[PDB]
Amino acid sequence: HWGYGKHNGPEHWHKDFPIAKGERQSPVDIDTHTAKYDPSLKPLSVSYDQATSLRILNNGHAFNVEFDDSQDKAVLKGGPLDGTYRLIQFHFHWGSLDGQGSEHTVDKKKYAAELHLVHWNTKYGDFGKAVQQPDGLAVLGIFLKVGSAKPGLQKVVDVLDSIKTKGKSADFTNFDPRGLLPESLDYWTYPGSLTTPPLLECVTWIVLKEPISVSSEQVLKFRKLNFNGEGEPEELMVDNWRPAQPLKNRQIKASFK
Ligand SMILES: NS(=O)(=O)c1ccc(Nc2nc(Cl)nc(NCCO)n2)cc1
Ligand SMILES: [Zn+2]
């Protein structure tokens, strides 16, 4: 099965998922000087006030904080998007060291981690149908750098002990994802893909320019998770990121000058 090791990592994925070498793969390097300001891009609308978190799951690749997406309770609209996209889950990708971990890079700079808030286009009815569409998903990407703690992340950090291994889940209600956002919603946007198998080309990427700061202690707790299941040899869940893929025939647009 695919993963992030030497023998099943990103350079191997194309064998089971040929779209890995496709025309709109993610992540990518964001070359800030080549991105073009698009004055027609609208401000992002992040409406998370009625978000209902339910559960947190270690899926063997990352951990997902899952939301009730059976109504318009937490939605992303505006920006480059047409219509309404519902929040279904967020997760992170992170490194074994603070100098790596993000999937997108900015002028080749790697951040310590990257948060993905995953949303699906309500015109397609559910996530499974949405991922089959070129405009099916909108993923809001937020970089993490190590410095001051992010207070709104701490409730996530403190439950990780209870989902150490693959397949473990825990109740995770009343978590407010607004506490994970930076001050500014300035963003870059481009058409891309899921960054893990099945690597489907269904995502409008919206990557915020402003990173959030998390503490060394907070990211160290991410690195104590396991890729393996309980009772299997311990393999730390670190470096669960795909590297930058070729931009090919795409332009990255900026919402800001
Ligand atoms: N890293 S990412 O591109 O944001 C991303 C987002 C979602 C998924 N996949 C996903 N996301 C959800 Cl909410 N459900 C399922 N069901 C399939 C489970 O195998 N798969 C993969 C990568
Ligand atoms: Zn992701």
Side-chain angles (χ1 to χ4, degrees), residues 80 199 216:
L199 297 168
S216 55

Side-chain angles (χ1 to χ4, degrees), residues 4 62 64 89-93 103 114-118 139 194-196 205 240:
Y4 295 96
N64 291 352
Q89 53 105 331
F90 71 75
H91 61 272
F92 304 79
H93 306 262
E103 295 208 303
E114 188 174 330
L115 166 62
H116 290 162
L117 293 127
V118 182
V139 184
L194 301 179
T195 65
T196 73
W205 276 95
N240 59 346

Side-chain angles (χ1 to χ4, degrees), residues 25-257:
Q25 289 290 290
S26 294
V28 299
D29 180 56
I30 301 169
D31 190 271
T32 63
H33 280 113
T34 294
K36 196 186 183 310
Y37 170 66
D38 185 344
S40 74
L41 281 168
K42 302 176 181 178
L44 262 189
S45 173
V46 181
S47 298
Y48 287 170
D49 48 283
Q50 298 291 302
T52 295
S53 65
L54 294 172
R55 194 178 72 143
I56 189 173
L57 169 73
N58 179 333
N59 62 19
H61 307 295
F63 64 86
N64 291 352
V65 173
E66 301 163 353
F67 290 81
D68 173 16
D69 67 345
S70 70
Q71 290 188 83
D72 283 342
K73 285 177 176 191
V75 301
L76 183 68
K77 304 176 182 176
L81 306 170
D82 293 330
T84 293
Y85 289 68
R86 273 187 204 164
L87 180 66
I88 175 166
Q89 53 105 331
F90 71 75
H91 61 272
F92 304 79
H93 306 262
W94 62 93
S96 57
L97 304 154
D98 295 351
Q100 65 194 40
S102 67
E103 295 208 303
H104 295 89
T105 54
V106 178
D107 297 331
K108 300 295 180 75
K109 173 187 175 65
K110 294 172 170 88
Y111 288 86
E114 188 174 330
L115 166 62
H116 290 162
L117 293 127
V118 182
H119 311 74
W120 55 272
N121 193 327
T122 61
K123 74 187 193 179
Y124 300 124
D126 67 19
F127 181 87
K129 277 291 195 293
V131 296
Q132 303 177 60
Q133 313 305 323
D135 59 350
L137 297 195
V139 184
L140 180 58
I142 302 183
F143 295 117
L144 280 60
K145 64 181 184 178
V146 173
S148 301
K150 191 69 168 179
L153 181 60
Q154 190 61 33
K155 286 183 182 174
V156 173
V157 166
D158 280 334
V159 78
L160 300 182
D161 276 337
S162 78
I163 57 153
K164 187 179 178 179
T165 50
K166 181 178 187 188
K168 296 285 194 185
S169 65
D171 294 319
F172 201 67
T173 55
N174 302 286
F175 180 78
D176 190 341
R178 292 177 294 187
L180 298 175
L181 305 176
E183 284 183 5
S184 182
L185 293 182
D186 288 345
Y187 64 87
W188 295 285
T189 182
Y190 74 98
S193 73
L194 301 179
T195 65
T196 73
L199 297 168
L200 295 171
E201 294 179 332
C202 59
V203 182
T204 298
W205 276 95
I206 299 169
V207 178
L208 296 190
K209 170 177 48 65
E210 184 175 357
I212 60 167
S213 289
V214 302
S215 65
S216 55
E217 292 86 7
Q218 288 180 320
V219 68
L220 286 161
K221 290 185 184 185
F222 285 12
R223 303 180 183 135
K224 289 178 66 181
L225 289 163
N226 281 187
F227 285 125
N228 53 284
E230 184 182 6
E232 300 173 358
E234 188 180 37
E235 317 170 85
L236 296 179
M237 179 180 284
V238 298
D239 297 315
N240 59 346
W241 50 277
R242 189 189 197 192
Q245 300 303 303
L247 188 61
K248 293 180 172 178
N249 187 41
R250 294 178 286 180
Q251 284 180 358
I252 299 178
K253 294 176 187 170
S255 76
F256 61 95
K257 287 181 173 175

